[PDB]
């Protein structure tokens, strides 16, 4: 809706940074609204949904087991690993790692899951195979959050990842059990949801994954809608701002508020 565009613009002005935005109709994939939809932005932790989609694809193919136990060590622990730092001695199952990676944004969990699939190049190969010609993962956590000027590594476009999320959450790319598991992880309550959950009406569904990185990178991908069912995909990215984190979050939240008001 045009009013959302005005709010995207206002976010660019307040943040001193580009903002990319797309809304899709979930059933048809039709583009309902867009701003900078084909420009590149860092994925940051929004990639963790794509990662878990690749894991679940392997589960469906009999190449992985959700119950397989992954053992790791102290040196594997990187910053912002609130779940994995509690399981050095006992390990975590693949299922537990995907829950941590998505709901808690656990960085080491994502790195371990990347090992399970064979690394960033294998994620990127999966994405290419499902028809995403843009998204690329090059590095693991935390270095993928760098947000360096002029660096194409670890980027997507709003348009690409919106279509990829639609492929993962609907249709037959994943089995029903795996689709539902991915949605369950994305819907699970989290500690703080400033970007959209904070705008979402009661009784609406949201399955979301946020991201935050260096150099102003911030983003969210989501399927949301009224009446306990998703009906749209929304993707919002920004990078480059040096405004406070609170200001970044507020500006993106106001985009969400507008989307909901003018739904
Ligand atoms: Cl545009
Ligand atoms: Cl564009
Ligand atoms: Cl730089
Ligand atoms: Cl959030
Ligand atoms: Cl700050
Ligand atoms: Mg200003
Ligand atoms: Mg060990
Ligand atoms: Mg191309
Ligand atoms: Mg809740």
From Swiss-Prot:
Active site: 45
Assigned EC number: 3.5.2.6
Residue numbers binding substrate: 209-211
SUPFAM superfamilies: beta-lactamase/transpeptidase-like
Intrachain disulfide bonds: 52-98
Catalysed conversion reaction: a beta-lactam + H2O = a substituted beta-amino acid
Effect caused by changing residue 14 to K: In TEM-2, TEM-3, TEM-8, TEM-16 and TEM-24
One Gene Ontology term from the biological process aspect of the record: beta-lactam antibiotic catabolic process
InterPro entries xref list: Beta-lactam/transpept-like, Beta-lactam_cat, Beta-lactam_class-A, Beta-lactam_class-A_AS
Pfam families xrefs: Beta-lactamase2 (PF13354)
Substitution effect: residue 214 to K: In TEM-5 and TEM-24
Enzyme class: hydrolase
Keyword terms of this UniProt record: Antibiotic resistance, Disulfide bond, Hydrolase, Plasmid, Signal, Transposable element
Biotechnology: This protein is used as a marker in many commonly used cloning vectors, such as pBR322 and the pUC series.
A molecular function GO annotation: beta-lactamase activity
Record-stated family: Belongs to the class-A beta-lactamase family.
NCBIfam families found in the cross-reference section: bla_class_A, blaTEM
Note: The beta-lactamase present on pBR322 was cloned from plasmid R1 (R7268).
Function description: TEM-type are the most prevalent beta-lactamases in enterobacteria; they hydrolyze the beta-lactam bond in susceptible beta-lactam antibiotics, thus conferring resistance to penicillins and cephalosporins. TEM-3 and TEM-4 are capable of hydrolyzing cefotaxime and ceftazidime. TEM-5 is capable of hydrolyzing ceftazidime. TEM-6 is capable of hydrolyzing ceftazidime and aztreonam. TEM-8/CAZ-2, TEM-16/CAZ-7 and TEM-24/CAZ-6 are markedly active against ceftazidime. IRT-4 shows resistance to beta-lactamase inhibitors.
Protein's UniProt name: Beta-lactamase TEM
Species whose genome carries this gene: Escherichia coli
